[PDB]
Design a protein around this ligand. Structure first.
Ligand SMILES: [Mg+2]
Ligand SMILES: [Zn+2]
Ligand SMILES: [Zn+2]
Ligand SMILES: [Zn+2]
Ligand SMILES: [Zn+2]
Ligand SMILES: [Zn+2]
Ligand SMILES: [Zn+2]
Ligand SMILES: [Zn+2]
Lengths: 45, 53, 56, 279, 168, 65, 110, 98, 53, 147
């Protein structure tokens, strides 16, 4: 499974496949993908 | 990391450098533009105190 | 000019059919296939010709 | 007769074409010796820019309508000529059937997916021998119900029956033999949010009736007696657990369920109230 | 009009032009990316066998390099994936396509181009950045101004048309 | 936005003068030129930064993440 | 990049414009085209004898174009025909024919 | 050194437009062709070449260069090889040269 | 990074921040040191952790 | 400076003068024709997928999307989508060997590059799972830029 975040209440869902697209506890179908857990290198120039 | 200002402007320790020379125009390096008179329009600089007309 | 033009030839009796190199059809996503307009016109000529032959 | 062009590298000739396709340069090249295999590559995206085989097949047709500068006499003579050639093909029933089915689906506010599934089902049945009639109403209603069952949608028999008068029995037989046709060409939970939408209930009562529906499906006893009554008694219990008042008469006249049935199910349901608590 | 009298053609580049007084009258500053994108097929001769050999041994990534080779049999080998083979030796009669270096005359044009002066050949000078650099004594026959004006650059692909283009 | 670091010409650090600047404006009720005269800015290259700044981060923070 | 041919290479000089005779159309064509359908009934290949059969040209590179063989980047194309049972007029000549009808007798043809 | 003429020097409000060079510069050297005319496509996203219109050809005629015009309208764009017959000048010559 | 500002924007602002640079004479350059990446001879490592309370 | 030309200070550019952000949004959507063929967002495997682009697929996840924050460049696939095919429908080249599906992903522009800002997935009107992507890129003022 992959970690997802709800639109409004911003709760951690982490639903798997074949579970459609819908938040638990609220009916907001907008689910975030969350940012990667690895580091990203940048340059100040 | 270490670097000079040629790599990026973030390595600039110095700021505004006030460069001046010849307060009273005698070396004839600048021809002042004037509408009526150059002595009444162009003000005097500070360094003029350290010399004389 | 007898070797090039004839009033009998001015009246159309048989119609040439150009190859797809002139009217290239498309098969997009294997389920959305588009045919050119001249292809539809040839289909209309065939339906009208076969219909006229059946009625005659 | 053959006509299959297979690209191979005459210098490598060590394996079937394991090649790479360079679209920016318009070539295809062997990924081994680096030798190009073809130049001047054609595109499929570019020819598609100007522009249904699944239903219409390979049939082509063109409309004749009025022109910018034309007479109304010629428009009628061309349309009457097509009216005499319309008997050459028996495809007039597909366009009219899809038109009326389009009107019914547009009247039921169903999504386009159920419309395409129902049209596909009617295209699979069409005019077979085992149908043998049904006056075009039962194959349309049963096709809509089939397209509803395929798209994971839930529509009760009394709903399509409320739309079309198919006399139920002949509807059941036509739906059965139609299901046999579909099997020869080779779930009550979805009803809860719909009735909760009919009553205007919060989400907690909806998911509470979901857990209650699943648990009641696991407890057995009565088993179901059609899933509609299980749904209405489940929502009835989940709404008698809170304080939002609807009573039994309003929910019985809105959802078209008998009061004695929701009380008969509310009795044994109240008997199984123990193991139905989610929190 | 769109397929016989005119047509969209290859071997061209379009971008914003700007001034540069340090350049000559006939030259034009070409960006490095355009010089590496466009190419020119040169014929392998004993006078430049070592130079073209160096261009092959440099690779398409470097600017002084090549892109494709054409053997005398009329077959093109790409320099990419050719390094996996190892060595590529040139012979007399082949045509190696190199990048646009210096002293390469190419046609310069600006639409709508109503003069015969609006299309004139130029000597390529490879310069960085992305804008075509040129002298301001040529902006008057082009009727151009350095305010977002784009121009077109066409490259000849033959020695005969390059010499005829340089003498006319 | 949110106080430009350094300056866009001379290069002097100004980011540590915003909080004081507002502090001199909301407490002493002085003018803009007087406050810029108290911060130590003597060239207009810097003055255009603080004088023409449009702090939009405050209107950005009012959104819930 | 096309395949070599042994035919003598010459330039194109004189160009003659003339009308297409029906006999010459039938002598140039290779197919009759009777089915108004595009592809085959199996929704694949071609109809074989229809609007776009392998007897004409082909695209998609992979197909070979039966009667030229070779490929699409080489195939000039091939011509079909349509034999009508009732003669029709050509648009660009409707006026001209009319003028001919006003220049010759309508019986003895003089 | 001091400049002889004084310079008009002061701040001025400026704006940056949408037009940028990174969305304008593009070069094409042998790319994809269209399906209809088998000519270079149109558009920078599709890796398309520049258009050699009618006025450009008229300028090439004004300069008197016919070889560059022939090369630009054949090898630089599209060049096809066909076979015609001696009696009739039509392209009905079936060529099976294998 | 949950800020409303962009990541490379914050990296730019951090790039404009000045630092102390006295004994920088005896700190070798990144290319001059023969190690991989960095080491206590070329650069100085810093970190920032902020959280709204 | 001649002919409306301007000379800009480089040290001012390095300190962030006229620097702007560009946000490009790539919207993709899976669709179903006649319910039998269903497009699915997934990471295409290089073993059974035909018509696969030469771009890299290491930045995609298990659902066929790029998580925000991953630095992407041109010719990079952002959203992986595959379409089912029939064995006896085309059989072109190696289609009789891959058997499975055909690639139909939506990559980033050829000349573009940057950092993926935000990615969101939602069902539209008819319930089709579509996904919108937004990539940010700082465009430092160059010589060819207009003012
Ligand atoms: Mg202009
Ligand atoms: Zn939620
Ligand atoms: Zn045989
Ligand atoms: Zn090979
Ligand atoms: Zn300043
Ligand atoms: Zn052919
Ligand atoms: Zn002949
Ligand atoms: Zn080190």
């Amino acid at each position: 499974t992959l970690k997802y975040i709800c639109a409004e209440c911003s709760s951690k869902l982490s639903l798997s496949r074949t579970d459609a697209v819908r938040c638990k506890d609220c009916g907001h179908r907008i689910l975030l993908k969350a940012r990667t857990k690895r580091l990203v290198q940048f340059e100040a120039r | 990391k270490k670097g000079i200002a040629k790599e990026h402007a973030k390595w600039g320790p110095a700021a505004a450098i006030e460069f001046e020379y010849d307060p009273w125009n005698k070396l004839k390096h600048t021809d002042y533009w004037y509408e009526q008179d150059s002595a009444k329009e162009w003000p005097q600089s500070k360094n003029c105190e350290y010399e004389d007309p | 000019n007898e070797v090039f033009s004839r009033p009998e030839w001015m009246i159309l009796t048989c119609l040439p059919v150009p190859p797809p190199p002139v009217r290239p059809s498309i098969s997009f996503n294997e389920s959305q296939r588009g045919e050119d307009d001249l292809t539809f016109k040839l289909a209309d000529i065939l339906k009208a010709n076969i219909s006229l032959e059946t009625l005659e | 007769p053959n006509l299959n062009i297979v690209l191979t590298c005459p210098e490598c000739k060590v394996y079937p074409p394991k090649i790479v396709e360079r679209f920016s340069e318009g070539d295809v090249v062997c990924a081994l010796c680096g030798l190009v295999l073809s130049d001047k590559l054609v595109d499929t995206r570019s020819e598609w820019r100007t522009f249904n085989p699944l239903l219409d097949g390979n049939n082509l047709s063109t409309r004749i309508g009025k022109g910018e500068t034309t007479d109304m006499r010629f428009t009628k003579e061309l349309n009457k000529a097509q009216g005499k050639n319309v008997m050459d093909k028996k495809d007039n029933e597909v366009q009219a059937a899809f038109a009326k089915i389009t009107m019914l689906c547009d009247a039921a506010e169903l999504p386009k997916i159920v419309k395409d599934c129902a049209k596909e089902a009617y295209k699979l049945c069409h005019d077979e021998k085992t149908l043998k009639g049904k006056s075009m109403e039962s194959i349309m209603a049963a096709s809509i119900l089939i397209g509803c069952r395929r798209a994971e949608v839930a529509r009760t028999f009394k709903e399509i029956q409320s739309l079309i008068h198919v006399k139920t029995k002949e509807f059941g037989k036509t739906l059965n033999i139609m299901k046999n046709i579909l099997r020869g060409k080779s779930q009550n939970l979805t009803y809860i949010p719909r009735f909760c939408s009919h009553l205007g209930l919060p989400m907690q009562v909806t998911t509470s009736a979901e857990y209650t529906a699943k648990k009641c499906k696991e407890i057995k006893e009565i088993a179901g007696k059609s899933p509609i009554t299980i749904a209405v008694v489940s929502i009835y219990l989940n709404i008698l657990l809170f304080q939002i008042p609807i009573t039994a008469a309003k929910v019985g006249q809105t959802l078209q369920v008998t009061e004695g049935t929701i009380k008969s199910g509310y009795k044994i349901l109240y008997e199984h109230r123990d193991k139905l608590v989610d929190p | 009009r769109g397929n016989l009298m005119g047509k969209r053609v290859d071997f061209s580049a379009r971008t914003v032009i700007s001034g540069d007084p340090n350049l000559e009258l006939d030259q034009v500053g070409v960006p490095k990316s355009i010089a590496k994108t466009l190419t020119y097929p040169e014929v392998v001769t004993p006078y430049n066998i070592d130079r073209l050999t160096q261009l092959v041994r440099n690779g398409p990534n470097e600017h002084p390099g090549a892109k494709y080779v054409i053997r005398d049999s009329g077959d093109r080998i790409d320099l990419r994936y050719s390094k996996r083979a190892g060595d590529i030796q040139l012979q007399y009669g082949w045509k190696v396509e190199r990048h646009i270096m210096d002293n390469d005359p190419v046609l310069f044009n600006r639409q709508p181009s109503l003069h015969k002066m609006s299309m004139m050949a130029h000597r390529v000078k490879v310069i960085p950045y992305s804008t075509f650099r040129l002298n301001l004594s040529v902006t008057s026959p082009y009727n151009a101004d350095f305010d977002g004006d784009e121009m077109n650059l066409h490259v000849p692909q033959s020695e005969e048309t390059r010499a005829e283009l340089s003498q006319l | 936005m949110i106080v430009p670091v350094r300056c866009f010409s001379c290069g002097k650090v100004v980011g540590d003068k915003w909080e004081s600047y507002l502090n001199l404006l909301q407490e002493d009720e002085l003018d803009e030129g007087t406050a810029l005269s108290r911060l130590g800015l003597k060239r207009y290259c810097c003055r255009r930064m603080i004088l023409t700044h449009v702090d939009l981060i405050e209107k950005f923070l009012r959104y819930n993440p | 990049g096309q395949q070599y041919s042994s035919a003598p290479l010459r330039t194109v000089k004189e160009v003659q414009f003339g009308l297409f005779s029906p006999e010459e159309v039938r002598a140039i064509s290779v197919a009759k085209i009777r089915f108004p359908e595009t592809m085959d009934e199996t929704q694949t290949r071609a109809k074989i004898g229809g609007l776009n059969d392998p007897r004409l040209g082909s695209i998609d590179r992979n197909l070979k174009c039966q009667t030229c063989q070779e490929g699409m980047n080489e195939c000039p194309g091939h011509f079909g025909h349509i034999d009508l049972a009732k003669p029709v007029f050509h648009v660009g000549f409707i006026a001209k024919i009319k003028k001919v009808c006003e220049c010759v007798c309508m019986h003895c043809g003089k | 050194k001091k400049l002889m003429a004084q310079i008009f020097f002061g701040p001025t409000y400026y704006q940056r437009l949408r037009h940028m060079v990174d969305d304008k510069i593009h070069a094409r050297a042998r790319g994809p062709m269209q399906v209809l005319t088998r000519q270079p496509v149109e558009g920078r996203s599709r890796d398309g070449g520049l258009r050699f219109g009618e006025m450009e050809r008229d300028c090439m005629i004004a300069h008197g260069a016919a070889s560059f015009l022939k090369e630009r309208l054949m090898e630089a764009s599209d060049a096809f090889r066909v076979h015609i017959c001696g009696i009739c000048g039509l392209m009905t010559v079936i060529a099976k040269l294998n | 990074n949950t800020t409303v500002l962009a990541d490379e924007f914050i990296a730019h602002r951090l790039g404009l921040i000045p630092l102390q640079s006295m004994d920088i004479e005896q700190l070798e350059y990144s290319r001059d040191c023969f190690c991989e990446d960095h080491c206590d001879k070329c650069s100085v490592v810093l970190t920032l952790q902020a959280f709204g309370e | 400076n001649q002919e409306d030309s301007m000379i800009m200070n480089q040290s001012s550019i390095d300190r962030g003068l006229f620097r702007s952000l560009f946000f490009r949004s790539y919207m993709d959507q899976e669709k179903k024709y006649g319910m039998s063929i269903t497009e699915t967002f997934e990471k295409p495997q290089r073993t059974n997928t035909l018509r696969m682009k030469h771009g890299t697929y290491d930045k995609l996840d298990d659902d066929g999307l790029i998580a925000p924050g991953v630095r992407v460049s041109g010719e990079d696939v952002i959203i992986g989508k595959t379409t089912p095919i029939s064995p006896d429908e085309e059989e072109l080249g190696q289609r009789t060997a891959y058997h499975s599906k055909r690639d139909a992903s939506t990559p980033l522009r050829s000349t573009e590059n940057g950092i993926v800002d935000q990615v969101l997935v939602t069902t539209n009107q008819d319930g089709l799972k579509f996904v919108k992507v937004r990539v940010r890129t700082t465009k430092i003022p160059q010589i060819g830029d207009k003012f």
